[PDB]
Amino acid sequence: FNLKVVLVSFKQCLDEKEEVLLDPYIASWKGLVRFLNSLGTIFSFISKDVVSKLRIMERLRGGPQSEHYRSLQAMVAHELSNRLVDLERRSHHPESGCRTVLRLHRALHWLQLFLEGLRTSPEDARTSALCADSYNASLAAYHPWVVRRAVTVAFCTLPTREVFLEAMNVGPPEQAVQMLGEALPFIQRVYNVSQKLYAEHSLLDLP
Numbered sequence: 249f250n251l252k253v254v255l256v257s258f259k260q261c262l263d264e265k266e267e268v269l270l271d272p273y274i275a276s277w278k279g280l281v282r283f284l285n286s287l288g289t290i291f292s293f294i295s296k297d298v299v300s301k302l303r304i305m306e307r308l309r310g311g312p313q314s315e316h317y318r319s320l321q322a323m324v325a326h327e328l329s330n331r332l333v334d335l336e337r338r339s340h341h342p343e344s345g346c347r348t349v350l351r352l353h354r355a356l357h358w359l360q361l362f363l364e365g366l367r368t369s370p371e372d373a374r375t376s377a378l379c380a381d382s383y384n385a386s387l388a389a390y391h392p393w394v395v396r397r398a399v400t401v402a403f404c405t406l407p408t409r410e411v412f413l414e415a416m417n418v419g420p421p422e423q424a425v426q427m428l429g430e431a432l433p434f435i436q437r438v439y440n441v442s443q444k445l446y447a448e449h450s451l452l453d454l455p
């Protein structure tokens with residue numbers, strides 16, 4: 249089990265017609281949780297939010313309407329038609345299938361930015377400031393200043409640029425960086441598809 253294993257499991261999230269299958273997506277996320285946890289990081293507390301959300305999508309896929317949660321496209325279609333999404337404010341659907349995936353989608357965005365910033369960096373780069381750039385380019389818009397100003401402090405508990413690279417269990421840093429340019433574009437496709445879908449239906453601002 250390593251980071252390459254995870255990043256190429258996303259290959260399975262996109263069917264032959266470019267739909268995003270739920271079951272692999274969840275499975276791929278159970279791995280990302282697993283990898284987050286393997287780091288001796290303060291940021292393992294957010295893995296309870298992920299697992300929480302992953303269990304949301306697991307009950308929907310397991311419920312009486314399993315078939316509509318086969319894919320994100322199916323899910324969006326079903327939930328928008330049946331009016332099961334709080335488009336305006338949270339009211340009766342605070343745990344919509346749509347908005348839940350939206351949070352993991354945004355999280356998926358910070359990941360590829362950081363992994364890229366990890367890949368295309370000087371070998372003496374501050375990982376705290378790598379993260380801050382990635383964070384401010386993704387999640388920061390959706391977080392209150394209190395969360396913003398504090399999560400920055402916690403970016404300092406982060407290991408070094410090397411320390412991240414061997415943590416992936418692929419070998420020396422220079423061979424982590426090589427696999428990073430090869431295992432990445434699987435998650436980038438899933439993101440891009442999911443991004444397009446959520447944007448076709450004006451769903452990038454679900455509360």
Ligand SMILES: CCCCCCCC/C=C/CCCCCCCC(=O)N[C@@H](COP(=O)(O)O)[C@H](O)/C=C/CCCCCCCCCCCCC
Binds near residue numbers: 283284289352358
């Ligand atoms: C070599 C890199 C290793 C990292 C691998 C991580 C793989 C799994 C993904 C990690 C990044 C996901 C972080 C969480 C994303 C936040 C999304 C979010 O907006 N959550 C919110 C949902 O709220 P609600 O809608 O009301 O239920 C929630 O309010 C916020 C919770 C978490 C806030 C903390 C912000 C995260 C800061 C940046 C992440 C740093 C990750 C640490 C690096 C290991």
